[PDB]
Amino acid sequence: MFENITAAPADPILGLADLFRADERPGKINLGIGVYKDETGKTPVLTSVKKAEQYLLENETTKNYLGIDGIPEFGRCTQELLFGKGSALINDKRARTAQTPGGTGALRVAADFLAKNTSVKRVWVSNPSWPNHKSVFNSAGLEVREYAYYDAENHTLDFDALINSLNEAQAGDVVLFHGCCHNPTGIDPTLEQWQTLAQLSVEKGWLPLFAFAYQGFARGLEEDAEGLRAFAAMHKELIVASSYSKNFGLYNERVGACTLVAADSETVDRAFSQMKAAIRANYSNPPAHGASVVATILSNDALRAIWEQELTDMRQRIQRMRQLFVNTLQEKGANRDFSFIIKQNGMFSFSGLTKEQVLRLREEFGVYAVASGRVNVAGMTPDNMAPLCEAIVAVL
Amino acid sequence: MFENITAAPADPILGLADLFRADERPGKINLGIGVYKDETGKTPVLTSVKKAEQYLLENETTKNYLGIDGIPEFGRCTQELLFGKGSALINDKRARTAQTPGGTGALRVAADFLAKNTSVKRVWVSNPSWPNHKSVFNSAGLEVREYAYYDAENHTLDFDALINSLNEAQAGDVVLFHGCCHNPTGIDPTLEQWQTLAQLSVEKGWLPLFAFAYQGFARGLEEDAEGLRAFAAMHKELIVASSYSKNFGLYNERVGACTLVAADSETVDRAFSQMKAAIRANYSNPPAHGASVVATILSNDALRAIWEQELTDMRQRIQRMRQLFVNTLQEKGANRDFSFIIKQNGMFSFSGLTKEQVLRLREEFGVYAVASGRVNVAGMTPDNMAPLCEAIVAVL
Ligand SMILES: *Cc1c(COP(=O)(O)O)cnc(C)c1O
Numbered sequence: 109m110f111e112n113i114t115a116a117p118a119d120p121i122l123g124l125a126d127l128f129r130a131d132e133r134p135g136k137i138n139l140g141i142g143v144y145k146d147e148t149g150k151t152p153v154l155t156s157v158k159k160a161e162q163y164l165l166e167n168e169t170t171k172n173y174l175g176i177d178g179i180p181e182f183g184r185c186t187q188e189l190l191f192g193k194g195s196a197l198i199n200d201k202r203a204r205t206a207q208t209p210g211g212t213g214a215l216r217v218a219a220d221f222l223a224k225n226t227s228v229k230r231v232w233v234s235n236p237s238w239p240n241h242k243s244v245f246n247s248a249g250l251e252v253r254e255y256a257y258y259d260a261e262n263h264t265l266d267f268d269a270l271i272n273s274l275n276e277a278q279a280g281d282v283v284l285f286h287g288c289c290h291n292p293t294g295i296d297p298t299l300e301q302w303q304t305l306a307q308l309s310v311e312k313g314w315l316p317l318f319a320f321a322y323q324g325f326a327r328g329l330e331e332d333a334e335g336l337r338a339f340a341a342m343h344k345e346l347i348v349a350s351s352y353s354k355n356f357g358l359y360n361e362r363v364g365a366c367t368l369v370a371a372d373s374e375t376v377d378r379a380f381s382q383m384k385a386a387i388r389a390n391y392s393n394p395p396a397h398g399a400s401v402v403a404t405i406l407s408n409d410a411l412r413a414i415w416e417q418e419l420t421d422m423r424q425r426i427q428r429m430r431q432l433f434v435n436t437l438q439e440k441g442a443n444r445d446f447s448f449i450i451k452q453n454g455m456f457s458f459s460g461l462t463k464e465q466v467l468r469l470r471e472e473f474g475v476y477a478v479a480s481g482r483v484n485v486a487g488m489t490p491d492n493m494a495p496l497c498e499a500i501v502a503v504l
Numbered sequence: 505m506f507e508n509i510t511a512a513p514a515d516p517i518l519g520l521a522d523l524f525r526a527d528e529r530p531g532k533i534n535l536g537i538g539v540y541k542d543e544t545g546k547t548p549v550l551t552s553v554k555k556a557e558q559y560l561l562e563n564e565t566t567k568n569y570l571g572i573d574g575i576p577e578f579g580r581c582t583q584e585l586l587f588g589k590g591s592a593l594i595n596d597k598r599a600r601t602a603q604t605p606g607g608t609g610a611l612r613v614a615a616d617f618l619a620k621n622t623s624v625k626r627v628w629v630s631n632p633s634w635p636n637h638k639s640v641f642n643s644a645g646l647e648v649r650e651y652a653y654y655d656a657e658n659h660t661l662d663f664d665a666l667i668n669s670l671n672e673a674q675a676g677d678v679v680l681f682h683g684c685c686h687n688p689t690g691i692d693p694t695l696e697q698w699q700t701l702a703q704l705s706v707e708k709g710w711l712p713l714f715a716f717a718y719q720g721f722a723r724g725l726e727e728d729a730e731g732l733r734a735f736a737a738m739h740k741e742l743i744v745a746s747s748y749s750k751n752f753g754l755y756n757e758r759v760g761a762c763t764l765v766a767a768d769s770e771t772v773d774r775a776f777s778q779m780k781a782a783i784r785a786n787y788s789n790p791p792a793h794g795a796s797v798v799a800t801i802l803s804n805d806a807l808r809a810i811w812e813q814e815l816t817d818m819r820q821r822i823q824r825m826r827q828l829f830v831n832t833l834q835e836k837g838a839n840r841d842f843s844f845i846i847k848q849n850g851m852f853s854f855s856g857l858t859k860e861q862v863l864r865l866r867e868e869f870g871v872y873a874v875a876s877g878r879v880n881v882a883g884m885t886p887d888n889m890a891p892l893c894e895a896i897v898a899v900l
Pocket residue numbers: 142209210211212213238291319321351352353354359363364788
């Protein structure tokens with residue numbers, strides 16, 4: 109059976125952790141994957157989730173299976189964080205969320221649902237985008253098409269071109285948007301542009317799939333959901349795949365959510381029973397620890413208040429590092445003006461480096477970036493800021 | 505998009521938990537799903553996993569992502585438990601295991617792999633079998649076909665007929681077998697019959713998929729793996745989907761394993777890089793808590809010794825209840841001889857009840873069984889043994 113099976117290409121993001129850990133040169137710098145690090149270069153588990161894990165250890169009685177859709181308290185808090193305290197989707201029983209194994213689990217379950225229960229042929233994804241989008245939809249059966257986004261010269265969102273390529277997206281097609289913190293560019297639309305986009309979507313009949321992985325890392329939790337909320341107010345149907353791996357630092361417990369909205373409660377519930385049938389034939393029900401922890405923190409005032417400060421601290425450290433990277437690049441030789449990275453939101457930096465410059469930085473200096481030029485800013489500390497800036501100058 | 509989507513049929517096993525929890529009659533009896541209960545009717549979290557969770561709380565530093573395949577120590581212990589201390593597959597670097605979200609996650613990842621990377625068209629499943637088998641393979645793309653198993657009159661495995669229906673399974677087809685504790689019959693082959701089956705498989709060129717959910721609940725951990733070990737010794741290629749939800753009482757943390765074996769290390773590794781590519785486009789990597797706990801218990805001598813006693817206690821309670829169910833059924837009116845259930849291994853009892861008798865028991869008396877006649881013996885305690893036996897007699 110297995111004789112002619114060729115090896116698969118390494119994952120562009122995930123494959124770097126392999127090489128990084130096989131390196132054995134003492135001064136290497138990882139900069140690759142979107143995991144946060146502190147001034148010390150470590151990824152600590154948050155104080156607020158430790159407090160919650162202690163609680164759960166003292167307070168659980170059973171490990172018996174969860175429902176297909178997971179914990180109810182989890183699903184209701186997720187809806188509030190995304191849609192608003194007193195929203196109409198919530199009050200009209202127009203939304204249902206299932207707890208998933210991470211945001212990728214949420215994206216596959218949506219893909220599986222639409223493939224089986226809809227007439228969707230195409231999903232539209234931005235150029236550039238998270239590399240694994242194309243792979244989750246292709247395994248479900250769906251064609252991936254691209255819409256222009258970001259012009260490289262002026263380091264801006266090229267709005268007129270995003271309109272003009274989406275003009276050939278048919279009524280019925282899926283269109284993925286990033287809620288906030290575009291991966292990999294870090295360039296999101298203004299609220300005025302999101303308005304212009306909510307409009308058009310309704311004029312043309314596209315189904316919006318919103319992807320959230322970084323809510324809280326751009327301006328704040330509420331401020332970052334205003335593009336999704338501008339769309340909710342105009343739409344009858346929407347699906348959103350959400351993740352809590354980044355803003356809760358719960359990367360390996362696999363906590364996310366796939367939330368479905370339709371016109372009324374009867375229609376969302378008919379649809380949701382199909383979504384649960386797709387879940388049952390993949391894993392059977394969701395992992396409990398991670399989501400049990402989110403709900404506990406979100407349900408307690410003391411623990412919620414501590415969490416939001418911990419996340420405010422991470423957003424601010426990343427901002428300090430963004431400017432330091434730019435000031436240092438200029439002090440050490442940079443032949444280009446890299447001011448434009450101060451204008452991007454999130455963990456990343458679409459630096460502009462060519463694939464050969466990225467390949468060299470790795471080979472000769474051991475600093476690890478993705479071959480697109482994306483570098484994780486939250487990987488940078490005061491102590492490794494001069495080494496890696498020097499290393500870039502040499503390769504320019 | 506969602507307007508004409510009909511509702512899905514309720515899950516035959518999972519849908520009973522809904523009805524049971526909506527019932528509000530004080531004396532109901534659940535008996536449906538394969539979750540163990542103690543003399544008190546509760547499902548406690550094991551002492552040995554509590555000790556391990558305490559340890560992990562004290563001793564973790566980070567929640568940063570795991571590898572696509574999960575924890576190495578987890579995968580190596582899983583291989584020993586299944587194949588043997590000093591086995592040749594282990595020594596010849598012929599097996600690779602990935603950590604999955606439960607045994608169902610393990611079955612889907614195998615289905616996905618074979619669909620994408622092989623020429624498999626058919627999977628052969630026993631009649632009867634776990635109801636959700638057909639659903640995981642159909643979502644992957646594969647046809648499910650059935651082989652005879654178990655004759656209802658003599659309450660035995662009908663070996664000659666299992667041979668004769670499998671005679672039309674072609675070279676290249678998958679054939680699922682249950683390692684031990686057949687769900688739902690509780691009837692496994694003798695070691696002599698497993699030998700006869702290992703033989704034939706090699707003569708005909710079928711790829712064996714072994715499913716394990718109950719290792720340890722039939723005779724003991726080592727004794728229950730001897731059919732799989734009889735097959736390993738003859739085969740070049742095998743895949744096994746394993747679960748730790750039942751024998752570790754870790755039902756909602758979602759811990760399993762999908763282990764691939766091929767002829768040599770180069771071939772297993774080429775094949776395994778494809779299996780990891782299917783994992784990346786489903787969830788991205790596995791949930792850590794559950795598997796971190798299995799590995800900790802399996803790695804410590806004190807905690808391992810406590811675990812094996814906890815599992816010996818569960819196997820024995822289920823055995824006490826099997827006999828009590830039979831002695832009581834006869835004392836209260838049973839018009840049939842139900843001795844045959846003392847001859848079955850595992851949590852269950854394929855009682856023989858008709859779907860209308862099962863539907864009545866529920867409606868009128870509130871005892872919940874699956875519509876096939878399967879009842880969970882581990883749900884029975886000394887205190888609810890007389891109520892439910894009476895309730896069956898009334899319906900006979
Ligand atoms: C991190 C990330 C994901 C994956 O989320 P998980 O919660 O780890 O599954 C998906 N998409 C984007 C853009 C991400 O940054």
